[PDB]
Amino acid sequence: LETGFDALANDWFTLPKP
Amino acid sequence: KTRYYLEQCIPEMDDLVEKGLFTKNEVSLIMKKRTDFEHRLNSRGSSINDYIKYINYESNVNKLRAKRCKRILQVKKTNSLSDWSIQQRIGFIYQRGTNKFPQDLKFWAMYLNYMKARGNQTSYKKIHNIYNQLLKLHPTNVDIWISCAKYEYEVHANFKSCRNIFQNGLRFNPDVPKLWYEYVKFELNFITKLINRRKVMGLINGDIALTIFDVCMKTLGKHYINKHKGYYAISDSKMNIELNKETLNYLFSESLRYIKLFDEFLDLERDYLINHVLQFWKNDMYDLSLRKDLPELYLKTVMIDITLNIRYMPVEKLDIDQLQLSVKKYFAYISKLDSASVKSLKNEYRSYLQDNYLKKMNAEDDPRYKILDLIISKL
Amino acid sequence: IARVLAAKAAVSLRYDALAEDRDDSGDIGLESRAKVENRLSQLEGRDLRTTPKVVREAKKVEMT
Amino acid sequence: SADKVDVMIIQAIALLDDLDKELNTYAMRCKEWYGWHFPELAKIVTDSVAYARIILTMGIRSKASETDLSEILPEEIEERVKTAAEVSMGTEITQTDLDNIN
Amino acid sequence: PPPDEEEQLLAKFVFGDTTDLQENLAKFNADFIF
Amino acid sequence: PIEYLLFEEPTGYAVFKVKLQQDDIGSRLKEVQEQINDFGAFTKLIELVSFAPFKGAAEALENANDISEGLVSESLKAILDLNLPKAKNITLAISDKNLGPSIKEEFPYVDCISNELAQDLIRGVRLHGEKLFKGLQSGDLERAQLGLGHAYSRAKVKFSVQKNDNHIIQAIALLDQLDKDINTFAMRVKEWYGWH
Amino acid sequence: DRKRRQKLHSASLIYNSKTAATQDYDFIFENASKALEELSQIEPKFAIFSRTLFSESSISLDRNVQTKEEIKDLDNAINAYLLLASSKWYLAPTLHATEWLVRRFQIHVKNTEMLLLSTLNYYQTPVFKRILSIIKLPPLFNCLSNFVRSEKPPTALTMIKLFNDMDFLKLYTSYLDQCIKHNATYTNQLLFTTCCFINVVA
């Protein structure tokens, strides 16, 4: 059985201004 | 509440000064560094690296205390609070760190490795609690499920518990082929040890895995269909056929892995186990016939069947009758295969015989060599 | 730079447009480019804000 | 001399602008037409050419699991489209529909 | 008896000693680096 | 008497543990209600113990139908089995009363509660959402709802692509565009080759 | 106090003020140790600062709590480092390696003149602009006060004005003397040094 867990240890709403 | 942690260390410090291991000036230095770490952990922006640093610092203090015990006290263990104080404290930091940052698998791994090292101090029951809590937070990480499965089958050799781990893990993650692979690997390991123990018993005086294989094949197929389809079904018939083909190739590669797995276990009847896998693929699946729709996969199935009887026969024990059976199988499949497939199945079979038997036999001393060369020529 | 670049563009453009025996090299444009870059360099090297100078306070000295 | 006629320049620059406009309209049609199948792509990948290439590499959201978009997209973008593919709101399309969109 | 070298290394980290550092600063000869 | 809380997300099932039981007689008092709104106070009441994300889009739709009908999915049975201790009877807070009988049948040792105290806790979980997961990967709840909403809705309606006529609209808009551009570019080819 | 700590720790040559305030000495030391090793490969002499200026015990060394004799030895080691780093400021690791000295030893506050003199010829490089922001200009370098926290880098003209001052020339003369004795001079230094000296005559 192999586990890496152990190895893991070590704006849209603005109008144009005239 | 940083101060409340500070009084908890006072009884330890008084013990250190009382035993004479550490001077008041030195003990003051220890308290100053602990004070900084306690502030760091309780402040905003605290990270797991702060917990690791404090754990590392406490470990060094434990080492220094131990050597000063033999150096000054000249005793292996002084019966006082100082002996188990650091070890108890380090576990407390781990508990706080894991609770604060359940995401970090790195800190969980250090927590388990640290305690498994001190098996005497930390009972295996507490280890189960950590594995229990970790599994709840991350049920979908198969690596954790195998870790407690592996730990309880090696350290404790409790096969009953380890089976429950795999049963529970597969329940949460039935779509991960890796977890099924390891569970079968565990299953065959138990049988091999059990048979070896039976062999030892006589000296001093498996199908179950295939069922796990079969259900693995079905469930992985379902989830692979659930993926690649999303919320909705696929209307077009041609795509649905392509999805069926994807599962077959996906499952066929997965089954091929189990075929490779069987080879490792010498004690078990690998030919019997492999023949069941061949029988599984002979059945029509998802309305697609391997012979018609996926001849390339069918050819590999035919090759394994042809070489099944002679796969594990050593060169020394090669039986001519068994070889004849292999060739008789090979000719039978040719009559039912297309010309292109026959040439492909042909070239593979010649290389198999040449590499495994002809190249490892002495041409001058073995009479079987001429028969093999003649068969290879005639094939 | 737009005023300078436009002036040098006309010089280069007129060389291109009205040439009986122009070489396809761009030598006039290249030399014109160097002039505009030199104009840019000195113009950019300018500092509009006045530089402050080293203050030298003649601090009162009383004997000890 | 055939190499010193300006009228090619005036036509080429006019043609270049025309190609930019037309290519833009075809790109919008592809985004809307293919957006029916998978509407989330346009927000992820804005470039029209990169958008079209994703269709060519993978025609259906199902293919997103195995198809690799490394040469078209960076790593972080290519995984975003894969996640979007399965959780998309779009509907399936036929090969006949797929062929013309390709 | 005097402590072992490994024990001194542990003590240096545990007590945060900097005397060994300060000695290196004093011995620092610029000509050697150049 | 509530110790565990079951909250269903589009991404998966989340189970919480109630650290402090808020006052029941004083539930309607303003200050206790304000605690639900405030994130800092809310963490003191509950803590996340387990989260089981759905494997994919298909599983989410299947459990949405089951949760809609008050049924216990295989995923819900697993997550409760791993979380709820065997134990007199463990108390589980569930939003839907119709789901209680189904949970009881699967687990005789759990008694489900859906009173106003439970609803307040369920309401608080919905308010803070991803903030309560302590960073654990829950994707994004807004986008997950969007995809699941279309899936849930279209399943009941039985919508099919065959009804789709948007292909016709796109084809017509593309066809006349092709005719204009075929004509447009062809004229340029005459102009360009007209010189020669 | 906290406010004084915020200003001192906020100063950084690699990171902005907000991120800098969050960082810790151990994190900064880790990057500096890796940077020095890269510098050590480029030039062996950088390794000598590992035993002294980039040691682990240097993390616990605050400059405030020593006597005068330890400070002068402390200044000497830093002054030597700035000389070797002078020619490698183009390399990225030098910036990371110098971050530890700025953060641990506050060289921008104490050894401000030495730092500026070493990096004079990098006036147009972005690193010099960042130095100006985090450094209080000595009386001689008042000409650069305009460009402190400014978009435009110092211009070549303003460099001449700093060199035009007689007192600055004496200061630069001494610094240039130290390089000649240590054979630490390099072409880019000579190019900038000659140009300023030639322009000052003009």
Side-chain angles (χ1 to χ4, degrees):
Chain A
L1 281 56
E2 181 191 24
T3 81
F5 174 33
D6 295 328
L8 187 60
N10 291 317
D11 185 84
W12 172 266
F13 293 100
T14 50
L15 275 165
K17 195 131 72 162
Chain B
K1 70 211 303 176
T2 185
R3 176 53 89 95
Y4 284 140
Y5 299 116
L6 299 198
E7 293 83 4
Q8 296 293 323
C9 301
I10 291 173
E12 183 178 1
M13 301 325 198
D14 177 27
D15 182 16
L16 294 174
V17 178
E18 185 63 23
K19 297 292 185 293
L21 299 185
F22 295 80
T23 74
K24 295 185 174 64
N25 274 336
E26 289 169 338
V27 163
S28 177
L29 299 175
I30 310 304
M31 187 66 204
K32 178 180 301 183
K33 192 59 162 171
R34 292 188 181 181
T35 302
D36 292 289
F37 278 112
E38 287 292 349
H39 301 347
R40 215 179 302 268
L41 269 44
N42 293 16
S43 162
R44 62 150 71 80
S46 63
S47 67
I48 203 72
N49 296 356
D50 295 333
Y51 293 83
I52 298 163
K53 287 272 222 302
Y54 189 51
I55 287 161
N56 172 288
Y57 174 76
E58 278 176 351
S59 170
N60 287 282
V61 176
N62 196 13
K63 298 167 194 173
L64 179 56
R65 185 192 60 78
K67 308 297 255 167
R68 290 194 167 188
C69 202
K70 199 167 297 180
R71 180 177 178 271
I72 313 173
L73 283 176
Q74 301 161 4
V75 181
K76 293 210 74 56
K77 267 178 283 179
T78 186
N79 54 3
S80 196
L81 179 63
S82 66
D83 277 350
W84 60 88
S85 48
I86 299 288
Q87 304 278 74
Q88 182 177 0
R89 205 142 298 152
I90 292 168
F92 183 63
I93 311 307
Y94 269 117
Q95 289 179 1
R96 291 201 294 168
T98 44
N99 189 359
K100 182 65 70 64
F101 303 103
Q103 303 184 85
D104 187 13
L105 274 295
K106 312 277 212 176
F107 199 71
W108 282 104
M110 287 206 217
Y111 191 15
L112 279 162
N113 290 351
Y114 160 81
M115 294 177 71
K116 285 178 186 186
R118 56 194 284 258
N120 180 17
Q121 311 327 317
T122 64
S123 173
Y124 53 71
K125 191 186 287 184
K126 174 51 178 175
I127 309 301
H128 286 160
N129 298 347
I130 297 169
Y131 269 121
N132 199 5
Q133 175 176 356
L134 177 49
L135 285 167
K136 298 184 183 251
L137 297 167
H138 311 260
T140 58
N141 187 19
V142 295
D143 293 331
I144 313 300
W145 289 98
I146 308 159
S147 179
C148 60
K150 177 183 188 188
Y151 161 76
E152 209 160 5
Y153 155 81
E154 191 276 331
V155 174
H156 297 308
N158 306 345
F159 65 98
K160 302 173 193 213
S161 70
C162 174
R163 289 174 187 273
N164 303 348
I165 296 298
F166 279 113
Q167 293 291 353
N168 289 318
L170 294 174
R171 186 181 192 167
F172 274 92
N173 310 329
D175 67 303
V176 180
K178 176 186 178 189
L179 192 53
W180 290 100
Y181 188 81
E182 303 305 343
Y183 182 35
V184 172
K185 185 192 298 182
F186 167 74
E187 185 64 26
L188 271 70
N189 288 351
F190 164 84
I191 301 299
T192 49
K193 199 281 202 174
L194 180 55
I195 293 165
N196 288 351
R197 178 182 176 185
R198 174 61 70 232
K199 182 263 287 181
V200 168
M201 186 279 288
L203 282 193
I204 64 188
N205 289 340
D207 68 347
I208 183 163
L210 301 186
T211 63
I212 301 300
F213 166 89
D214 192 9
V215 299
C216 173
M217 295 299 291
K218 178 42 60 165
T219 186
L220 290 181
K222 292 181 180 181
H223 300 305
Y224 195 98
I225 294 295
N226 297 350
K227 298 290 178 66
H228 290 236
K229 278 195 173 183
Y231 289 113
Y232 316 92
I234 296 181
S235 61
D236 179 23
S237 175
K238 283 183 109 202
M239 301 325 178
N240 182 29
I241 298 163
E242 300 218 71
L243 277 296
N244 301 335
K245 288 178 178 177
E246 292 265 30
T247 51
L248 290 198
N249 190 1
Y250 159 61
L251 293 187
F252 200 109
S253 295
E254 191 46 10
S255 70
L256 186 52
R257 287 286 295 297
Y258 282 104
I259 289 289
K260 180 83 200 215
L261 184 51
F262 295 144
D263 300 343
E264 304 161 359
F265 310 85
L266 296 174
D267 294 345
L268 296 169
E269 291 70 71
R270 294 166 278 179
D271 283 318
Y272 177 76
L273 301 175
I274 290 164
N275 177 47
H276 192 282
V277 175
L278 299 172
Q279 189 64 358
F280 181 45
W281 288 130
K282 279 172 183 171
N283 303 326
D284 182 9
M285 198 150 197
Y286 290 116
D287 306 320
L288 292 173
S289 192
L290 271 158
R291 183 169 168 204
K292 294 181 178 177
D293 306 303
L294 292 167
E296 182 267 359
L297 296 186
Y298 192 47
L299 279 174
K300 289 173 183 172
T301 310
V302 166
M303 181 271 257
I304 295 161
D305 182 26
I306 290 163
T307 57
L308 188 62
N309 65 314
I310 56 170
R311 206 138 181 207
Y312 306 113
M313 186 64 78
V315 180
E316 298 161 10
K317 296 186 178 184
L318 184 69
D319 178 13
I320 298 166
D321 293 339
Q322 295 299 327
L323 182 72
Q324 283 184 14
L325 185 61
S326 182
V327 174
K328 189 223 295 165
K329 287 179 176 196
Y330 170 76
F331 278 117
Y333 278 112
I334 288 163
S335 59
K336 304 171 186 173
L337 280 159
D338 58 293
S339 55
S341 296
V342 164
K343 294 187 287 291
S344 189
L345 185 62
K346 167 166 155 136
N347 291 340
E348 287 191 351
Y349 189 52
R350 317 281 273 266
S351 305
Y352 179 91
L353 293 176
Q354 156 75 49
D355 291 336
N356 287 310
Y357 303 106
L358 192 148
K359 204 132 161 183
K360 302 183 191 164
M361 279 199 201
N362 284 346
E364 304 184 335
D365 301 315
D366 201 330
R368 298 172 288 192
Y369 182 91
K370 52 152 178 62
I371 300 169
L372 291 170
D373 192 48
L374 284 168
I375 288 162
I376 283 159
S377 77
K378 283 182 174 183
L379 279 165
Chain C
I1 297 296
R3 206 206 306 103
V4 176
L5 179 139
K8 290 292 183 294
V11 164
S12 295
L13 160 64
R14 285 157 184 172
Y15 178 92
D16 285 339
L18 317 174
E20 299 173 356
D21 298 327
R22 157 181 65 78
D23 57 328
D24 202 33
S25 78
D27 55 340
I28 308 307
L30 289 170
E31 197 174 297
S32 292
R33 184 176 177 87
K35 290 183 179 65
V36 183
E37 294 177 12
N38 284 2
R39 178 56 177 169
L40 177 62
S41 70
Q42 63 185 356
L43 188 62
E44 284 295 347
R46 293 270 180 174
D47 48 355
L48 275 293
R49 61 187 298 172
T50 182
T51 189
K53 293 181 182 293
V54 174
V55 68
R56 289 181 178 83
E57 293 101 15
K59 265 172 109 167
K60 183 172 73 66
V61 298
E62 58 284 347
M63 281 145 48
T64 299
Chain D
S1 61
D3 60 354
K4 290 187 180 190
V5 292
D6 57 2
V7 291
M8 311 295 79
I9 291 164
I10 298 105
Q11 292 175 356
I13 199 76
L15 180 59
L16 198 62
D17 291 331
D18 193 307
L19 263 64
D20 291 331
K21 293 187 288 289
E22 272 313 319
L23 180 53
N24 193 19
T25 61
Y26 285 106
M28 281 305 178
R29 180 70 57 231
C30 200
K31 287 185 182 181
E32 289 181 350
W33 193 1
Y34 187 70
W36 193 254
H37 182 57
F38 175 63
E40 300 85 0
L41 198 52
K43 313 182 191 142
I44 297 165
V45 63
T46 69
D47 189 6
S48 302
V49 180
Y51 184 101
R53 295 252 298 289
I54 296 159
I55 295 175
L56 303 171
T57 57
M58 61 145 268
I60 318 294
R61 299 168 292 177
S62 168
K63 302 293 181 64
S65 179
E66 63 271 22
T67 306
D68 52 354
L69 280 298
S70 55
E71 67 276 27
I72 299 163
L73 311 165
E75 192 184 11
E76 65 279 7
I77 294 92
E78 86 170 62
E79 58 83 14
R80 284 171 41 81
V81 294
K82 290 184 184 293
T83 61
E86 64 191 3
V87 310
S88 58
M89 62 195 208
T91 188
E92 186 47 65
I93 52 158
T94 63
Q95 181 65 22
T96 316
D97 302 333
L98 187 63
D99 283 21
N100 289 109
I101 301 175
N102 290 127
Chain E
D4 190 16
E5 164 61 7
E6 56 85 23
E7 179 169 348
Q8 298 154 19
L9 295 175
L10 278 166
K12 180 170 179 64
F13 178 79
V14 166
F15 303 140
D17 185 75
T18 61
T19 61
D20 189 1
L21 183 63
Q22 194 59 237
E23 296 315 322
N24 304 353
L25 276 166
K27 295 191 292 293
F28 184 101
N29 293 317
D31 199 329
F32 280 39
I33 297 88
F34 301 104
Chain F
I2 299 171
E3 294 181 353
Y4 291 121
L5 183 143
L6 175 61
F7 197 81
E8 43 267 50
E9 284 287 339
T11 56
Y13 293 111
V15 174
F16 298 72
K17 182 167 188 177
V18 186
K19 298 180 291 182
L20 172 43
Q21 294 175 359
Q22 47 175 354
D23 201 341
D24 58 357
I25 299 175
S27 294
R28 311 286 217 171
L29 271 51
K30 66 181 295 188
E31 70 281 7
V32 296
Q33 300 290 4
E34 201 196 310
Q35 299 278 73
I36 300 294
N37 296 318
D38 186 6
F39 184 20
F42 192 65
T43 56
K44 282 132 200 183
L45 291 93
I46 62 167
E47 193 276 332
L48 191 149
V49 296
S50 175
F51 172 61
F54 303 137
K55 303 142 191 53
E59 185 184 4
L61 180 62
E62 295 159 0
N63 295 10
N65 300 357
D66 297 0
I67 288 294
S68 176
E69 294 294 330
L71 304 185
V72 173
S73 305
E74 59 155 40
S75 172
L76 180 58
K77 185 176 180 180
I79 189 63
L80 292 190
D81 191 1
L82 176 75
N83 288 309
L84 291 183
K86 174 56 212 64
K88 167 197 177 179
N89 271 17
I90 193 66
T91 291
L92 180 65
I94 60 177
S95 180
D96 189 3
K97 84 184 156 171
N98 286 31
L99 191 68
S102 305
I103 293 167
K104 190 62 174 182
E105 191 270 8
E106 301 290 358
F107 308 113
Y109 54 110
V110 64
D111 51 348
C112 297
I113 292 187
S114 52
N115 61 3
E116 185 173 353
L117 201 173
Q119 299 305 123
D120 284 351
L121 293 184
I122 300 295
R123 187 159 148 122
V125 175
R126 203 180 305 285
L127 186 47
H128 306 118
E130 63 96 21
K131 275 213 171 203
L132 293 158
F133 284 81
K134 309 163 297 180
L136 281 293
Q137 295 190 358
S138 176
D140 55 354
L141 315 182
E142 193 275 332
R143 204 181 330 271
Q145 286 171 336
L146 190 156
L148 189 56
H150 282 268
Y152 181 81
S153 296
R154 289 171 52 176
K156 308 183 76 64
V157 173
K158 308 185 182 307
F159 194 22
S160 171
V161 65
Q162 159 53 36
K163 291 279 205 171
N164 189 10
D165 64 327
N166 286 58
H167 298 286
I168 296 162
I169 304 179
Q170 298 296 291
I172 279 288
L174 191 47
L175 272 175
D176 59 4
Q177 184 61 255
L178 285 177
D179 297 330
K180 176 184 298 165
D181 309 325
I182 290 156
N183 184 57
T184 311
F185 286 171
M187 301 275 88
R188 324 311 271 281
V189 176
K190 287 181 177 295
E191 191 186 10
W192 270 68
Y193 190 82
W195 299 84
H196 164 85
Chain G
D1 68 333
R2 276 184 165 270
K3 300 299 293 296
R4 182 66 60 82
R5 175 62 69 181
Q6 183 176 0
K7 294 183 184 84
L8 295 167
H9 199 66
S10 288
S12 170
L13 284 178
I14 301 291
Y15 303 96
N16 62 280
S17 64
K18 298 296 186 296
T19 58
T22 315
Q23 288 180 354
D24 274 298
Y25 274 122
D26 293 325
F27 172 73
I28 300 158
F29 181 76
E30 172 75 280
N31 291 319
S33 302
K34 293 180 182 179
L36 185 67
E37 289 179 353
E38 303 184 12
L39 300 178
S40 177
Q41 299 275 29
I42 300 294
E43 173 173 0
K45 309 305 152 213
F46 283 113
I48 302 175
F49 304 117
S50 73
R51 66 182 180 179
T52 307
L53 289 177
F54 296 79
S55 311
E56 294 179 356
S57 61
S58 77
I59 305 169
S60 302
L61 177 55
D62 172 25
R63 286 187 58 174
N64 304 344
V65 296
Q66 310 85 69
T67 189
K68 299 181 219 307
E69 289 81 5
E70 291 174 358
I71 290 295
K72 68 181 178 67
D73 292 329
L74 193 141
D75 282 335
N76 296 340
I78 306 286
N79 290 349
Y81 172 87
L82 273 298
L83 294 172
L84 282 185
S86 183
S87 44
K88 283 82 169 179
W89 279 100
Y90 279 125
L91 314 180
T94 54
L95 197 70
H96 301 275
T98 311
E99 179 95 342
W100 176 239
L101 273 57
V102 176
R103 300 262 201 161
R104 186 65 268 189
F105 284 43
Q106 287 79 237
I107 58 164
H108 64 296
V109 162
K110 303 276 286 285
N111 293 316
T112 180
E113 279 191 358
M114 188 66 204
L115 197 156
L116 280 169
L117 281 177
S118 178
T119 58
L120 271 163
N121 53 0
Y122 301 96
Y123 66 92
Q124 46 171 19
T125 315
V127 61
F128 192 82
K129 264 172 42 172
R130 204 191 301 211
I131 289 164
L132 292 175
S133 64
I134 65 171
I135 206 163
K136 182 175 182 160
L137 289 166
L140 281 170
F141 303 80
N142 192 12
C143 299
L144 298 175
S145 61
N146 283 346
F147 304 98
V148 175
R149 191 179 59 82
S150 177
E151 189 209 19
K152 293 190 201 182
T155 72
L157 172 43
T158 60
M159 310 310 303
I160 296 155
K161 310 175 141 279
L162 179 59
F163 272 76
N164 202 2
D165 211 349
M166 293 177 70
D167 293 2
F168 179 85
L169 286 170
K170 305 164 196 301
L171 173 59
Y172 196 88
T173 297
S174 62
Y175 163 78
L176 183 63
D177 193 0
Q178 296 294 350
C179 295
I180 297 169
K181 293 186 288 291
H182 304 318
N183 310 57
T185 61
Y186 55 107
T187 59
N188 284 4
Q189 176 181 359
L190 277 296
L191 282 168
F192 179 86
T193 305
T194 58
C195 202
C196 288
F197 289 5
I198 290 313
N199 287 107
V200 160
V201 179

